[PDB]
């Protein structure tokens, strides 16, 4: 028997024996993630048991899709998949898929609250943008970047966890339900950078109504060319709000909050004013953000269908052995 079972909450992880001392570090939709020691690599890893991958076609095609993308979108700033396996030894039996990934040291939640120099601030942002660029290259728009989704190591390396609650980092066009593009994820980057500087969630609130208010309170009402673009119902709420001018970037992010230092401060603020843009058509792109003076200092080119359940099991199993 190559496998053993460990009970984790109301879940059992049946894992290869090389994975030892399993302990929970995550609990969220998709499910329990356990940290573990990998005896063969002499390294800590994270093990995720996919949730009910053969519950239905929808779950199956999404499992298969998750597998293929993790197996071939590799990059220094996306958490790498180290192994995948099943404890079941036939298709008849096949139920569970286990993903083994890199384990870093922490979330951004920690780091956001600590005060960081421009070097670290902007190097972290550079890595974020690079990881996001590779995702998009692979055709993956994240839509839910946030600090708990982004992980860091003690040598200032940064990776993005995966690809889709805290709704504070989600872009206005999601909030408003208007459809979205790649630079949906630039807003989130703006929110995380803003919070790194101010040390407080930029746009809190109970719900999306409260959310929007904080956005307009601080950034000002978007213009009519944004509103026209809204579905009529959402356009009628959004046009009845107070017509705020916005607090302006120098006052949302004064020199005071920062640690060249004045024209590193003002570069940071300029980058923030180009990401924290309500209108996606007027918001900076990943390529442009990477090209910004604040981030560009680190630039290194080297870094920048219908099937039955049975039929899906066949395809997924092929991927597990790969």
């Amino acid at each position: 028997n190559q496998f053993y079972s460990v009970e984790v909450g109301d879940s059992t992880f049946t894992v290869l024996k090389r994975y030892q001392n399993l302990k929970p570090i995550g609990s969220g939709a998709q499910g329990i993630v356990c940290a573990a020691y990998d005896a063969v690599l002499d390294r800590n890893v994270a093990i995720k048991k996919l949730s009910r991958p053969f519950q239905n076609q929808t779950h199956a095609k999404r499992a298969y899709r998750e597998l293929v993308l993790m197996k071939c979108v590799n990059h220094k700033n996306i958490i790498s998949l180290l192994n995948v396996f099943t404890p079941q030894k036939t298709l008849e039996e096949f139920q569970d898929v286990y993903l083994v990934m890199e384990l870093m040291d922490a979330n951004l939640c920690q780091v956001i609250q600590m005060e960081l120099d421009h070097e670290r601030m902007s190097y972290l942002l550079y890595q974020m943008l690079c990881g996001i660029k590779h995702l998009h290259s692979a055709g993956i728009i994240h839509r839910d970047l946030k600090p708990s989704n982004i992980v860091v190591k003690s040598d200032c390396t940064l990776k993005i966890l995966d690809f889709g609650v805290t709704r504070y980092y989600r872009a206005p066009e999601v909030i408003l339900g208007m459809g979205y593009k790649e630079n949906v994820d630039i807003w989130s980057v703006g929110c995380i950078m803003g919070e790194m500087v101010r040390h407080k969630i930029l746009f809190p609130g109970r719900d999306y109504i409260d959310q929007w208010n904080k956005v307009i309170e601080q950034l000002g009402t978007p213009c009519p060319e944004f509103m026209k673009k809204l579905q009529p119902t959402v356009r009628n709420y959004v046009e009845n709000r107070p017509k705020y001018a916005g607090l302006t970037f120098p006052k949302l992010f004064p020199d005071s909050l920062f640690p060249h230092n004045k024209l590193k401060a003002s570069q940071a603020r300029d980058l923030l004013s180009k990401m924290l843009v309500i209108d996606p058509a007027k918001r900076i792109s990943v390529d442009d953000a990477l090209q910004h003076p604040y981030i560009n200092v680190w630039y290194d080119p080297a870094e920048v269908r219908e099937h039955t359940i049975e039929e899906w099991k066949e395809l997924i199993y092929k991927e597990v052995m790969n």
């Binding site: 920690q110 670290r120 190591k153 003690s154 040598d155």
Partner: peptide, 10 residues
């Protein structure tokens, strides 16, 4: 340019 190699997560 020399990128940082430390981050005090501790």
């Amino acid at each position: 340019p020399k990128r940082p190699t430390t981050l005090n997560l501790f």
